[PDB]
Amino acid sequence: GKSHGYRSRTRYMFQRDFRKHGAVHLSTYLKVYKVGDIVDIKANGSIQKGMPHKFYQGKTGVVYNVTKSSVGVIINKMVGNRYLEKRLNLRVEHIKHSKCRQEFLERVKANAAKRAEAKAQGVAVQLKRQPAQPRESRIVSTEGNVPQTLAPVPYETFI
Amino acid sequence: AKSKNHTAHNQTRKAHRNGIKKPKTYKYPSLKGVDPKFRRNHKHALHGTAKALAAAKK
Amino acid sequence: QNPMRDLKIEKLVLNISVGESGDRLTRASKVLEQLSGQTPVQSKARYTVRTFGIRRNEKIAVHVTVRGPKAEEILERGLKVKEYQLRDRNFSATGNFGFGIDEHIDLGIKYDPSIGIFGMDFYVVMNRPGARVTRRKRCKGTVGNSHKTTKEDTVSWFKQKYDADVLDK
Amino acid sequence: QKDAKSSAYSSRFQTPFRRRREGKTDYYQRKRLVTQHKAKYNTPKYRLVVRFTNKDIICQIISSTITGDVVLAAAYSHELPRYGITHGLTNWAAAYATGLLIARRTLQKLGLDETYKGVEEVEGEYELTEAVEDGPRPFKVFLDIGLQRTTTGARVFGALKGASDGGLYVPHSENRFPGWDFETEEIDPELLRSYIFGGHVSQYMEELADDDEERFSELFKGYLADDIDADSLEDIYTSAHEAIRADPAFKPTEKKFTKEQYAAESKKYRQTKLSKEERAARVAAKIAALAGQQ
RNA sequence: CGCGGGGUGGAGCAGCCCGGUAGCUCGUCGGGCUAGGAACCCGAAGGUCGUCGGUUCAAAUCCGGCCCCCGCAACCA
RNA sequence: GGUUGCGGCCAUAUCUACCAGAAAGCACCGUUUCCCGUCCGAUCAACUGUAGUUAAGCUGGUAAGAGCCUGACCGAGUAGUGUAGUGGGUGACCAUACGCGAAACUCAGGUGCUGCAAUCU
RNA sequence: GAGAACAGAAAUCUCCAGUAGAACAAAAGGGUAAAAGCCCCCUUGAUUUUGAUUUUCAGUGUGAAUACAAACCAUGAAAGU
RNA sequence: GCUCGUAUCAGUUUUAUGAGGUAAAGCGAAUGAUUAGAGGUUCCGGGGUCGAAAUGACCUUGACCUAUUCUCAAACUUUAAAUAUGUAAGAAGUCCUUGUUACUUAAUUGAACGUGGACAUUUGAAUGAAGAGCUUUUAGUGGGCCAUUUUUGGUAAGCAG
């Protein structure tokens, strides 16, 4: 018959790594998670307790509960036509802080800092990010860079 | 007589008719599922702030 | 130079691998403890075989480890039986050597009617001071190549001491 | 030559952690002692690190960070000897004193000196530093024994007992101190007390002087040369430790040595790296004549 | 081309109330009976159990493959 | 800059074979009365700062070294692939348009970096 | 890989080398090396109470059970588990 | 139908940040396959100049050795795309010796939640938004089938999945 256990189809997902087996380096147990922190979920296959389900590998959530060894994570999961709020009790080895979250907080401070400098003089700092713009006009000098003319090559075997 | 066994055909289309809206977010989530030791202490701390605030704006 | 790295017997091991257990085993341990002065330990059988009549954990052998002056003094008594002659191939590549003798009475031991005849093997492990780095819990080291023991070095130390020789083989 | 392991074996070899392959840290036990309860978010779990080397007992109070472990205070056994008292620095009695030293030093640093005086009158009786009422809870540290073997009557528990009587609240049981009996689950306070003040070391001196004066001269020669008997215990008991040896700042360091000339003398005797160009030159020398054969 | 049993000396059977590293009968051989055959009496030999791979508490009996002896089902338009 | 203790990343750190190491530092180390488990004071436990041992550990250097790491208009815009045609081809498959784009290979470079507290001519 | 007196291809015994090429009840796949393997000591947390969660999912039941809370314990020097 | 005078949203992109073991690739990388030639060595057996002639002036499984070499994998893999996919891009956000607590800390240490203070044309990418959000109730349906692309069984099928 068919087989759908808890860890079915997890052969490579929960595989440890190449030359990264054994004990976990302790910085993962030194990281601190507060309620509201944005965390990623990458299950560590060596630690079998507090393991996320395979659905939650690669999912990013928000901490809502902090216990002795684990954090409660809220994750939005798509069930049918709507997202359901799921609550994961995950041990710290299976989570890490989202790096994009930390980068945006630096932008928040950088935006506030830039506003403070501009407010001293009113130079329209324009904190808002912009998409890559079409190139402006430029002049290409040819001195020392004479154009080298190219043609399609003939066909040949090379075997 | 054999029938069709399973297909997810048309299921994504059905789920998008009035569909995939995110769950509505609130200020003050429910404190169910959070540690009772924190919950019990939070109750006392919130009580004191209401008493402390009431004294200030008497 | 060579201030201290001279060879020295790390330990000498007395082995009696009796065929079975029971009366023959305890007597074998009784001679072993009488000759060493320290109580021996008893080896369990690793598995079963068809020819030796053996089974797992059957208490087949008995051996004791002696280090220090006692190990040297029983080696001299043991080497006395072999007229101070050992094979060249008798010495191991890693620097050890041992000899097996039957009728342990030839050592110079007062025979006792109960104990009887017991054939026992002497094995000697050689090293130089500083081997604790490879057997201690903290900072397990590997002995350097110059400080290691070789077959030629343990052969020469055997010939330099005791004026005992080896044959062409 | 030919005696080389497979390139496949070397390619697929996962090395242990540097401190694991140096035989230095039990990373299994270190995880337990370091991982703090997640609901005490940035509260540092403190370790009473005790490490024994020959001539040196090292006692440091340590917390953990991502960048590395941080020393809160330190206490080494090697503080006295260079002035002429090089005795027993490496025993149970010194392990006690440096455990007492780290406790008094650490407590005075964070301001809990006049409170939590610890066991002021030492009797060898097992007890914990108990919290005062209407006052702060005692400083908490956890024994870190590294790879050292935990045995009854171990030196690692000399620093444990010493740190406890110093005032540092260290959870422990009495079943690993000298004087604890195995038949009955009871301690012998006198035997533990004797070990703290060198009574076991002093006991060896008396019986050795009677039996083997030759050995009594080979070891404990310094005590004879320093004219040490059982009349100097009183001086170190009250006069030394309380009046002046409890606050021994009192030491010459206001001309802090020049690390630059420490570097200069070491560097000049350190072998230097061989650059890229000379490496090609050295391989050129071999190929031309020695390996070219003209 | 489905489902079942079975394979142990030349031959027939014993390990099937989970284990005596293989035993019992016929046959064969040796001796004795008898004036040779037979019948009878006394002794002996014979198979690591179809092959290969699995637990390693004497495991191969009980597990999974191929071969062989067979047996039953092979229908209703 | 050396070293020790505690660490972080966990080979640019491992592995092989040689060469070197002043002061500082394991211990050449020495011992078994005492706490401490056994055949073995070898490990482990405890006790000393001795002839003065750098022989080993350790650190560094070397090696057209193995491994590992970094990089490259090196291979290679190649393989692969998202989208497109009433493209081609009996088909097998392929070409083209708008995009994304490897891995081997080759060539170079690199021999851990670094935090805290001590200590060192 | 390196020896021995009946000791041998298989009894020991001792050194080497050895990233796991072993073992961990079973199927298979993951995981595990100062351990999750092997041996030793102590134990019954395979216990109380009733909530929250994850997987199949209707976000019903069942089965597993992940993290806690309030007790009682076990172990360990202890952190802890 | 119910709750507002600019809807906290989106089958999309961008930027940032994750997760993945497919395609491809690899096998002088592990596992498993697999074609050929390149040294020595009586550690049982196939044979002889000479007859055990002693480790004997030879080759044959290599019973002990490394350098190559041709070709591969749905249930192999160091590497590793494309497409698809999670999260974030703020007014419920950000900057003070506590304001509260019975939690936590050695400790006003923190944790959570707060009072006062500083921030509308840029309210912290793009594009769009057709009004947001929400509730109740009930019909029919619960035989499907066909392109392209991926893909399984099958010689195949206007075949089955």
Hey, which chains touch B, using 3+ CB pairs under 8 Å?
A
Rounded to 5 degrees, φ, ψ at D250 are 30, 50
Q: Is D22 on the interface with C (CB under 8 A)?
A: yes
Rg (Cα) of chain D, in Å, rounded? 26
Q: How far is the CA of B18 from the C1' of H120 (A)?
A: 34
DSSP 8-state assignment for residue C131? G
CB-based contact C9:C126 (threshold 8 Å): yes
Closest CA to C122 of C140, C135, C104: C104
D122: its two tokens: 């030492």
Q: Is D142 exposed, middle or buried (0-12, 13-18, 19+ CB in 10 A)?
A: middle
In chain D, what is the straight-line distance between the N-terminal and C-terminal CA atoms, in Å?
25
Q: Is A2 exposed, middle or buried (0-12, 13-18, 19+ CB in 10 A)?
A: exposed
Q: How far is the CA of C155 from the C1' of F62 (A)?
A: 33
- CA of C48: nearest nucleotide by C1' is E58
Count Cβ atoms below 10 Å from residue C86 Cβ, excluding itself.
Answer: 19
Q: Is B13 on the interface with A (CB under 8 A)?
A: no
CB-based contact A98:A38 (threshold 8 Å): yes
Query: What is the C-alpha to C-alpha distance for residues D39 and A32, in angstroms, rounded to an integer?
Result: 9
Q: Do A20 and D14 touch (CB under 8 A)?
A: yes
Q: How many residues does chain C have?
A: 169
Q: How many residues does chain A have?
A: 159
Query: What is the C-alpha to C-alpha distance for residues C126 and A51, in angstroms, rounded to an integer?
Result: 52
Q: Is the CB of A22 under 7 A from strand G?
A: yes
Q: Which residue of D has its CA nearest to A29?
A: D35
Closest CA to D40 of A34, B4, C18: A34
Q: What does DSSP say about strands D47-53 and D142-144: parallel, antiparallel, or unpaired?
A: parallel
Q: What SS3 state is found at C12?
A: strand
CB-based contact D160:D145 (threshold 8 Å): no
- CA of B33: nearest nucleotide by C1' is G52
Q: Is D100 exposed, middle or buried (0-12, 13-18, 19+ CB in 10 A)?
A: buried
Residues 6+ apart with CB under 8 A from D99: D50, D59, D75, D158, D159, D160, D161, D162, D163, D164, D166
Number of H helices, E strands in chain A: 2, 5
Q: How far is the CA of A32 from the C1' of H109 (A)?
A: 16
| G10 C1' closest Cα residue | C49
Q: Is C51 exposed, middle or buried (0-12, 13-18, 19+ CB in 10 A)?
A: exposed
Q: How many residues does chain B have?
A: 58
Residues 6+ apart with CB under 8 A from A127: A111, A114, A115
Q: Which residues share a beta bridge with A71?
A: A66, A90
| Chain A, chain B: beta-carbon pairs less than 8 Å apart | 32
Closest CA to D48 of D197, D126, D158, D154: D158
Rounded to 5 degrees, φ, ψ at C8 are -160, 140
DSSP class per residue in A66-107: E-SSEEEEEEEEEETTEEEEEEEEEEGGGEEE-HHHHHHHHH
The packing angle between helices D92-110 and D189-196, to 10°, is 80
Q: How far is CA A118 from the centre of its chain?
A: 32
Q: Do D37 and A71 touch (CB under 8 A)?
A: no
Query: What is the C-alpha to C-alpha distance for residues D23 and A88, in angstroms, rounded to an integer?
Result: 38
Q: Which residue of D has its CA nearest to A19?
A: D14
Closest CA to D15 of A108, C1, A23: A23
Query: What is the C-alpha to C-alpha distance for residues D247 and A57, in angstroms, rounded to an integer?
Result: 58
Q: How far is the CA of D279 from the C1' of F16 (A)?
A: 20
CB-based contact C96:C154 (threshold 8 Å): yes
Residues 6+ apart with CB under 8 A from A35: A63, A64, A65, A66
What is the distance in angstroms between the Cα of D26 and the nearest Cα belonging to chain C? 10
Q: Which residues share a beta bridge with C124?
A: C12, C97
DSSP class per residue in A55-67: GGTT-EEEEEEE-
Q: Do A30 and D65 touch (CB under 8 A)?
A: yes
Q: Which residue of D has its CA nearest to C138?
A: D23
CB-based contact D15:D24 (threshold 8 Å): no
Nucleotides of F under 7 A from a protein CB: 1-2, 4-11, 13-18, 20-23, 25-31, 33-40, 42-51, 53-68, 109-118, 120-121
CB-based contact D57:D90 (threshold 8 Å): yes
* Strand intervals (E) in C38-119: 41-43, 61-66, 85-86, 97-101
What is the distance in angstroms between the Cα of D12 and the nearest Cα belonging to chain A? 7
CB-based contact A54:A9 (threshold 8 Å): yes
D3: its two tokens: 């005696």
Q: Do B35 and A85 touch (CB under 8 A)?
A: no
CB-based contact D126:D63 (threshold 8 Å): no
Residues of A in contact with D44 (CB under 8 A): none
Chain A contacts in chain D segment 7-46 (CB below 8 A): 12-14, 16-17, 27-28, 30-31, 34-39, 41-42
Q: Which residue of D has its CA nearest to C133?
A: D23
Residues 6+ apart with CB under 8 A from A158: none
- Sign, CA dihedral B39-B42-B47-B48, equals positive
Chain C interface mutation, best of D22, D28, D151, highest count of C Cβ atoms under 10 Å: D22
Query: What is the C-alpha to C-alpha distance for residues D91 and D55, in angstroms, rounded to an integer?
Result: 9
Query: What is the C-alpha to C-alpha distance for residues A74 and A60, in angstroms, rounded to an integer?
Result: 9
Tally of CA atoms within 13 A in the half-sphere of D29 that contains its CB: 14
Residues of A in contact with D37 (CB under 8 A): 68
Query: What is the C-alpha to C-alpha distance for residues D129 and D123, in angstroms, rounded to an integer?
Result: 14
Closest CA to D59 of D104, D121, D12: D104
Query: What is the C-alpha to C-alpha distance for residues D269 and D252, in angstroms, rounded to an integer?
Result: 30
Q: What SS3 state is found at C92?
A: coil
Count Cβ atoms below 10 Å from residue D236 Cβ, excluding itself.
Answer: 13
Q: Do A82 and B23 touch (CB under 8 A)?
A: yes
C42: its two tokens: 């008893």
Q: Is B22 on the interface with A (CB under 8 A)?
A: yes
Q: How far is CA C152 from the centre of its chain?
A: 19
Query: What is the C-alpha to C-alpha distance for residues C78 and C91, in angstroms, rounded to an integer?
Result: 16
Query: What is the C-alpha to C-alpha distance for residues D174 and D152, in angstroms, rounded to an integer?
Result: 9
Q: What SS3 state is found at A30?
A: helix
CB-based contact D91:D155 (threshold 8 Å): yes
| Chain C, chain D: beta-carbon pairs less than 8 Å apart | 12
A73: its two tokens: 């994570």
Name the one residue in this structure whose structure tokens are 């998670």. Answer: A33
Q: Which residue of D has its CA nearest to C134?
A: D23
Residues of D in contact with A92 (CB under 8 A): 38
The packing angle between helices C69-81 and C23-36, to 10°, is 110
What is the distance in angstroms between the Cα of C138 and the nearest Cα belonging to chain D? 5
Q: Do B34 and A64 touch (CB under 8 A)?
A: yes
Residues of B in contact with A82 (CB under 8 A): 19-21, 23
CB-based contact A7:A14 (threshold 8 Å): yes
What is the distance in angstroms between the Cα of C137 and the nearest Cα belonging to chain D? 7
Q: Which residue of B has its CA nearest to A35?
A: B34
Residues 6+ apart with CB under 8 A from C143: C130, C131, C133, C134
Q: Is C32 exposed, middle or buried (0-12, 13-18, 19+ CB in 10 A)?
A: buried
CB-based contact C106:C122 (threshold 8 Å): no
Q: Is B49 exposed, middle or buried (0-12, 13-18, 19+ CB in 10 A)?
A: exposed
Query: What is the C-alpha to C-alpha distance for residues C88 and C97, in angstroms, rounded to an integer?
Result: 9
| F60 C1' closest Cα residue | D271
* Strand intervals (E) in chain C: 8-16, 41-43, 61-66, 85-86, 97-101, 120-127, 165-166
Query: What is the C-alpha to C-alpha distance for residues A27 and A45, in angstroms, rounded to an integer?
Result: 17
Resolution (A): 2.3
Query: What is the C-alpha to C-alpha distance for residues D117 and D127, in angstroms, rounded to an integer?
Result: 14
Q: Is D88 exposed, middle or buried (0-12, 13-18, 19+ CB in 10 A)?
A: buried
Experimental method: cryo-EM
DSSP 8-state assignment for residue C133? G
DSSP class per residue in chain D: ------HHHHHS--PPPHHHHTT---HHHHHHHH---TTSTTPPPPEEEEEEETTEEEEEEEE--SS--EEEEEEEGGGSGGGT--SSTTSHHHHHHHHHHHHHHHHHHHT-SSS----SS--------PPPTTSPPPPB-EEE-TT----TT-THHHHHHHHHHHT-B----STTSTT--SSSS---HHHHHHHHTTHHHHHHHHHHHHH-HHHHHHSSHHHHHTT--TTSHHIIIIIIIIIISSS---S--SS---HHHHHHHHHHTSPPPP-HHHHHHHHHHIIIIITT--
